[PDB]
Amino acid sequence: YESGVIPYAKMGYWDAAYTVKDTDVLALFRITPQPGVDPVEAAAAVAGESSTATWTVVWTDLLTACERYRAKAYRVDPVPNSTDVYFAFIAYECDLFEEASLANLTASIIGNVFGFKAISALRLEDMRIPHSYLXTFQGPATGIIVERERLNKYGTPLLGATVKPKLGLSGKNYGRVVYEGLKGGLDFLKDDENINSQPFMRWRERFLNCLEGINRASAATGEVKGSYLNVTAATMEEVYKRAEYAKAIGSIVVMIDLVMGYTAIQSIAYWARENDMLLHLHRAGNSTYARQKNHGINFRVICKWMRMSGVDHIHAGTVVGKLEGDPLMIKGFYDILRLTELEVNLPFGIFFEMDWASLRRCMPVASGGIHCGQMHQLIHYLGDDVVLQFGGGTIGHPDGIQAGATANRVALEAMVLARNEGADYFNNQVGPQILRDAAKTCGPLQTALDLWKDISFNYTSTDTADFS
Amino acid sequence: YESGVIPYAKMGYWDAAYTVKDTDVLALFRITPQPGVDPVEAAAAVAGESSTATWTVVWTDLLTACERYRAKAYRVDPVPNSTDVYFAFIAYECDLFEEASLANLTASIIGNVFGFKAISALRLEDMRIPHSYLXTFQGPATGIIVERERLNKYGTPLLGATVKPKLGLSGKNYGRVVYEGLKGGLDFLKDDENINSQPFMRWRERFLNCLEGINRASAATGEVKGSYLNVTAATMEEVYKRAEYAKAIGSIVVMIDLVMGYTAIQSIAYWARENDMLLHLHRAGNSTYARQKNHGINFRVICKWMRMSGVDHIHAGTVVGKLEGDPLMIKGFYDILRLTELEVNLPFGIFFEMDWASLRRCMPVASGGIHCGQMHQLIHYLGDDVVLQFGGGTIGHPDGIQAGATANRVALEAMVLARNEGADYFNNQVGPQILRDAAKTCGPLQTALDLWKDISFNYTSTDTADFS
Amino acid sequence: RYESGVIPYAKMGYWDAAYTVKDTDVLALFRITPQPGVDPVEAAAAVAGESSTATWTVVWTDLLTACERYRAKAYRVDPVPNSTDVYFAFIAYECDLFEEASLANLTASIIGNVFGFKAISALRLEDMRIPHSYLXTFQGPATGIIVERERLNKYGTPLLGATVKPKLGLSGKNYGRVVYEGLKGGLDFLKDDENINSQPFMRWRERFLNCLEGINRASAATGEVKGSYLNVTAATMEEVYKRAEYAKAIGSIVVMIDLVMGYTAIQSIAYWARENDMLLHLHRAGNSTYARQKNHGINFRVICKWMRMSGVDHIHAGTVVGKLEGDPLMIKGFYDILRLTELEVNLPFGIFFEMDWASLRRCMPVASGGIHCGQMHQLIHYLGDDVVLQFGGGTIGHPDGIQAGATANRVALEAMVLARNEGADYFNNQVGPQILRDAAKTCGPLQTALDLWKDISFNYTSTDTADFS
Amino acid sequence: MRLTQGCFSFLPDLTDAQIEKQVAYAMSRGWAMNVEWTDDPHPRNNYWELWGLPLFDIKDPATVMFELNEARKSCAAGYIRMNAFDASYGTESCVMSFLTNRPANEPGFYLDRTDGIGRQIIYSIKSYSVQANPEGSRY
Amino acid sequence: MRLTQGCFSFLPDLTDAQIEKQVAYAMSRGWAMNVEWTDDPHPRNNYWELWGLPLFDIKDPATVMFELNEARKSCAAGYIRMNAFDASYGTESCVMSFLTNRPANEPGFYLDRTDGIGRQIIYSIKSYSVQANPEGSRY
Amino acid sequence: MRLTQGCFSFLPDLTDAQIEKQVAYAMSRGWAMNVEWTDDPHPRNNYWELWGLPLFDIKDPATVMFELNEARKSCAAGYIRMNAFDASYGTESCVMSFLTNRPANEPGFYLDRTDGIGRQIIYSIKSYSVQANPEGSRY
Numbered sequence A, B: 001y002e003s004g005v006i007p008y009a010k011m012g013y014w015d016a017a018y019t020v021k022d023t024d025v026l027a028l029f030r031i032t033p034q035p036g037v038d039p040v041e042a043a044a045a046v047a048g049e050s051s052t053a054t055w056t057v058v059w060t061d062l063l064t065a066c067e068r069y070r071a072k073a074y075r076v077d078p079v080p081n082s083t084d085v086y087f088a089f090i091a092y093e094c095d096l097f098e099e100a101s102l103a104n105l106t107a108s109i110i111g112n113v114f115g116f117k118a119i120s121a122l123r124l125e126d127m128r129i130p131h132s133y134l135x136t137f138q139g140p141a142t143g144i145i146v147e148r149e150r151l152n153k154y155g156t157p158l159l160g161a162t163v164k165p166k167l168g169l170s171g172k173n174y175g176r177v178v179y180e181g182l183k184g185g186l187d188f189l190k191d192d193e194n195i196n197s198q199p200f201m202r203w204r205e206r207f208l209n210c211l212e213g214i215n216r217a218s219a220a221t222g223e224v225k226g227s228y229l230n231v232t233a234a235t236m237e238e239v240y241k242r243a244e245y246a247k248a249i250g251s252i253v254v255m256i257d258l259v260m261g262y263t264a265i266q267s268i269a270y271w272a273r274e275n276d277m278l279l280h281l282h283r284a285g286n287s288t289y290a291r292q293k294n295h296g297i298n299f300r301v302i303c304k305w306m307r308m309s310g311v312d313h314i315h316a317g318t319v320v321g322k323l324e325g326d327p328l329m330i331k332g333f334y335d336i337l338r339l340t341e342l343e344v345n346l347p348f349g350i351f352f353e354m355d356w357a358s359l360r361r362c363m364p365v366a367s368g369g370i371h372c373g374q375m376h377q378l379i380h381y382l383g384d385d386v387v388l389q390f391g392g393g394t395i396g397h398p399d400g401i402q403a404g405a406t407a408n409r410v411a412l413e414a415m416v417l418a419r420n421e422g423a424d425y426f427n428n429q430v431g432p433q434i435l436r437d438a439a440k441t442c443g444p445l446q447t448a449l450d451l452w453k454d455i456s457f458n459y460t461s462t463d464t465a466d467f468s
Numbered sequence C: 001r002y003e004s005g006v007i008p009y010a011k012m013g014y015w016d017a018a019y020t021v022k023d024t025d026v027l028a029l030f031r032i033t034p035q036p037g038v039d040p041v042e043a044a045a046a047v048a049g050e051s052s053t054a055t056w057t058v059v060w061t062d063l064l065t066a067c068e069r070y071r072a073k074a075y076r077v078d079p080v081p082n083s084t085d086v087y088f089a090f091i092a093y094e095c096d097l098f099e100e101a102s103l104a105n106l107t108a109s110i111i112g113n114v115f116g117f118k119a120i121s122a123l124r125l126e127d128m129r130i131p132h133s134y135l136x137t138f139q140g141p142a143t144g145i146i147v148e149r150e151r152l153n154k155y156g157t158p159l160l161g162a163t164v165k166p167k168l169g170l171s172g173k174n175y176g177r178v179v180y181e182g183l184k185g186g187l188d189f190l191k192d193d194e195n196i197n198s199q200p201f202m203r204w205r206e207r208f209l210n211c212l213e214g215i216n217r218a219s220a221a222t223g224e225v226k227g228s229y230l231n232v233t234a235a236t237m238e239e240v241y242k243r244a245e246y247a248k249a250i251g252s253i254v255v256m257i258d259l260v261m262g263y264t265a266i267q268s269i270a271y272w273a274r275e276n277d278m279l280l281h282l283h284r285a286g287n288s289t290y291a292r293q294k295n296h297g298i299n300f301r302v303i304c305k306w307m308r309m310s311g312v313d314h315i316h317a318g319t320v321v322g323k324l325e326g327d328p329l330m331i332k333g334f335y336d337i338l339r340l341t342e343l344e345v346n347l348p349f350g351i352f353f354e355m356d357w358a359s360l361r362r363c364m365p366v367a368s369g370g371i372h373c374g375q376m377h378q379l380i381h382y383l384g385d386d387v388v389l390q391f392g393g394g395t396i397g398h399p400d401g402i403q404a405g406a407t408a409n410r411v412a413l414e415a416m417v418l419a420r421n422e423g424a425d426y427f428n429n430q431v432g433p434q435i436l437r438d439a440a441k442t443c444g445p446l447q448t449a450l451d452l453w454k455d456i457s458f459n460y461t462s463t464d465t466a467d468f469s
Numbered sequence D, E, F: 001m002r003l004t005q006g007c008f009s010f011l012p013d014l015t016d017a018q019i020e021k022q023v024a025y026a027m028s029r030g031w032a033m034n035v036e037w038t039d040d041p042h043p044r045n046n047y048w049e050l051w052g053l054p055l056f057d058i059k060d061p062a063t064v065m066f067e068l069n070e071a072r073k074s075c076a077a078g079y080i081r082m083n084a085f086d087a088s089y090g091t092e093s094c095v096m097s098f099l100t101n102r103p104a105n106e107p108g109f110y111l112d113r114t115d116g117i118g119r120q121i122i123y124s125i126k127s128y129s130v131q132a133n134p135e136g137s138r139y
Ligand SMILES: O=C(O)[C@@](O)(COP(=O)(O)O)[C@H](O)[C@H](O)COP(=O)(O)O
Pocket: A161, A162, A164, A192, A193, A282, A283, A315, A316, A317, A323, A365, A366, A367, A368, A369, A370, A389, A390, A391, A392, A393, B049, B054, B055, B112, B115
């Protein structure tokens, strides 16, 4: 406490003998020190600058229970097969964090440490959110269970589709596409993430025409139907206005984009619970910080944060579609969103044991460049509680939108029926043959299988495991 | 328009002969194609999936003015000294974007393209926001000019300091530290980014004690004073409540954290204009996507987005402090925040010519690991319109907080006085001697210069220029 | 097990001697007196069943739920020492049984029906272990001891107060007079009596405005922050808020509420107090209807926990030596429950569970009723520094006026603490009374008070007593 | 029209052999089965009529098929569905529901439109079968 | 009038021997002492002027008494208070404050009254000493 | 106390030679200079009294010093400040302001506190010089 600079590891931010408490918030960082920076000093610096420290000693620590509030780096391990990169475990006292505030948790955990010169790269890989912090959060407004009860749909993935083209359609035409997709068999459609309100289509025209299409499709089929009406807007006031309008006209669901940001998202998640609305989260912008293994925030952490905030769906990957998704990483995300508790599972990137404290289950959504020919793979990797979304895969069908919709649904039901009978459906013989057998009695599926059979997206992953 | 998959470059998303319109939104991406992906196809894919395209052809394009709404990649250049990395220029029609909506602009420009398997890395480097889009945004609630008029402070950087330790202080003690720093000479102090409301200090206690300290310091000096009261909260409702409280008690200023997100930020920026409040933006989380050169969003783009949204201050780097900041990149950020228009300046990372459409000027803030011994460097790199913040550099002073404050201010005034007289102050002889000459008659400065003279943070930068 | 009909609660899963308590469980300790012929374990299983998921006959609808998770478990049943056919029963309840942040819901389960069960002749809730994870859902004290003392600029000594008397009948103007006099003569606070709300002899607004003149007058005459607990207790939430808002609008530092308002209104006002920068004093009106007798009801220590959770800033908690019931060991336990950051098992004090307070703020105990300054040594010994000592009759009953009464109490206080801090064995009957006489030689008010009341005591058999020494 | 509630209604009507394999799958998971009937096909008709109690750890899928075939003999013309329930923590809900019987002819529904405020429409889905005849006489 | 801030202001002015005993009590609790000065006696003057830093390391009470007598020699006529700080979890606050010095004559205060809405009065407590002269020249 | 408005008030009072170099800097930037006087030191006293008009592209810094010295001879005891104004687009504002004269003795201010709602205080900063005497007679 004499004035001046001393290493973070001498200031109380490194403790190899620290006993982790069940109330602690834990973070796992992948740290790449600058050349010459001690690995333990780097970890202590992340711990200090995300809790109580600055760069020079301050007497004002002595006005506080300083030892309680200092975070502790407690373990630093080399990353397998990754020279001079380290896994650093840090424990944070419960009382550091504002109750029910994602904004506050993130202000500490990600606020400044990623810009420190002394570390050339930093990635938040996982967190243990303690039971006692989780009970301060809502969790899912609806959750998987109540959602399926509202839909009267059980034992099979749900289906969806993004309306295309992305931009340019009028409200009337939007309602046409939604009518056709729903009537052909889809459970949902959705506005594209960038469909908000624009000169070619102001939002009220979209909302009202979509309700006509939705209701028409429900009366034509005897099923509950919906489409994710995008309430994403510039301001909280305008977002609320769009959400209120959707409620007032009877929509089962709305969507929001991650670019709205955490504070707006928590507001809408409370609103959705209060207003009997399903809340779909599109993860717009997520890959700006989640793509690369060396730096940023792993999407599994985002999963925890958004399940806490209380969205009902989140996009979580397809494995076989047009966007990045190593199967081990994806399986990990899906478990984080859907299970009541997590056990350590290093090949899935599950670094901490964690109870979910009975917060409701968040529905993963698999979307982007997928088609019905891959149905066996989607069922295998992703399971029952997922929404499988086919935008181009429905609207791209040469015999029309209802045909696209019908193809996806027949493929899905045929596949689940066979699985439940005990078919080795994931096998490369059996899966595509289940589909061909169904297609012999369904022209739409025959056509879809023929059109897209050669289509795959196989590229090297960036977001990969460190353990096998 | 026959059903099926065709390359994005055959779908209208690549046009080498495109004539850029003054109303277009332009984006510059640093694209790293996966091996075997054509550089032009990658650029067309980013253009398509951020405008109107999906992965397979859709007849529904034909219900729209499809040619108008398609974005166009119009130029693809190799990056200097960077094998198989490309600069890709893309133009977007004005009508794609919701008026006054950062959420909508970002939904398109960053929403999905960073997760595309076909591209191993993607970075948004710069954008040309057209005059006609800028007039839909507020710009700064107050801006540099009105801010200095409210302060009655001209011709010298403003001064600030973050209260430390980061977490643990009570409201009463917070007010003590703010009183002392302000009375010793600082224009401002501020809550730390992670100081919101917590068991050791609930926010109302901080706000009320701080107003006592602020007002005491103003009556002791005859100057306008303030401290950035942090209104960052979980929900828009709670954020508004804290902002309203700050207004009701007479605070000149509040702060917010970037982790609140764009929708909340735009709401508070409108609120700040409506309520005669200075609005300070802490950039919490920015380095999760802004640090690495291969992938994410360059901070210069964030500068544009936050100047549009209308914050009054944003943290923008120090060069010589504890956080990342190449001087050429920093100078570029500062110009983006402060100038009425931008000319192409490739070594500063200014890739587009751009008029700011008379949106007000945003005050850059230089903060983190800086001290008064560096004053010549700070004046040289950063100029007059900046807030220089010394948290540890004030509170770490061995003779107390008022002494820390006084040292910084004497150093600042001495340096500006000498500069205005024509001293070659940036020179390594003259700068530190100006400070020593002032210190001969000011014990606090003598002590501060002695304590921290050996302190530097020299490490290899990650966020560096491509041109010299 | 799921065939129709009646089976014992102990065979339905509500008894498990091998149950491992989880840190997230709510635990309850009940003193159970079974009817003659009722098995002690079955009685405990009945309490566990009927305060969790059971009814009196088997229902197949259990099988639509994760029934094993939700059943509470009686896990330990001990004989009560020296108390034939009475037992201590410990029962564990799953965290998920309870609505977040809701005292009404907690109490609906724990005390709802089981006290009326025919098969048990007497039941008392003695203690609870409220888990860390439930506590974080509650606000705790709106202000708490630490911020309260910062607001008052008063540290290192008990705070002083006084209930205005007579209880009923004074005008608002005369109320403000008593408050002025009391405060100027040295009291930190006065208060409305618990039954002073709004009445034909004094409508509440008259009280509030006149008291603010008195308070601000005393503050200007002394240089101290002063207040009086303006009673906002009213028939409806609407009227209570109106009174609270009015007190805030005119700048009162403090309001009071009565326990008879009930838990839901109390929680509402405790959130209001935090939001409105107000100190919130709780009078425990009605508490002794269920808390007095050892065989049946709710021990006041549990009420302490519930009220600290709900978030009052003060609660009356006993004096030992005054006119109301209070065994010293029981009282010391109440005070610890209100003031400490955590609790260790301390059977002689009635603390049956170890319990972390989860950084919920500290609740200020209030010692009130039939106490006088001749008792100052005892009050400091039993009760410590963080307490409000209230002398109603002991101020206003002083023969030389209200100011003199106030001054006598404050000089006694300061002289006693000065001497304690100096190392005096002040609780010793040879030392404390002499400290008071010594100060009294130079303070006529104190001499007079000592002469009038020094021999007054209230010594009777306690009903709410310990089971361990 | 074809009522497309249930999880296999885009496939042909299931044979008894197909139903039994679905039952076997659910029972192998430890799920409880029940059988329910209705002649109100409305999408919001949450509570179809119970055929006895759910069949909690009955182990032989033949016993579930017996009860389905008893329900088919006793119930009026209309719909029967087969459900599986998972009482596990995290679920405590239905996890499978598919139709085992449907009417030979389902007229379906129309969309009734009431003019609300501005351009809003207040919608009601009306069943042709339900509006014409009482429960037990609709098909 | 006599300013009765502090916890011993209804007792006579403390002698040095008495102050040392209070200091010793606080230091054997492990509390930190500091000394503060003001010439604004207002009850809401939260922040009296610091005399150096609080003495956290200090173990001998005479050291604290030395600093107190240094403050008394240096500061203008007015008030001095002695404080004890407890930084331990659950407190993190002042736990003792008493006046060591007061002016020989304190004129005190008046109550200034502004007519609010209805019968409400808007009150301000004004110091005679502060309204008359600036900091350093008030007593 | 020392009034610390202006940009050089933590340095010693500027000599005429120092002021002239500041003037020269501002005039070399193309900025317009003016001189202003007051004897109300309040932090919110936005509009000090103008000494004539601003000196728009006067080119010789000696002419600015002449006017400053004329103002010093004519104005009552109090404060004089020297300002530079930049009429350029993007600025259109003052870009330099520093004190050229201050009183020999400035008593400074006190903080007047009115009790607002709850715990809020309504603050007014009062000048000792202004409250005692009228403009032109304060120092
Ligand atoms: O804009 C798109 O590309 C989509 O509408 C998919 O359209 P298609 O179904 O026509 O591909 C989705 O937003 C992406 O799936 C988002 O990716 P993720 O789910 O990975 O966040």
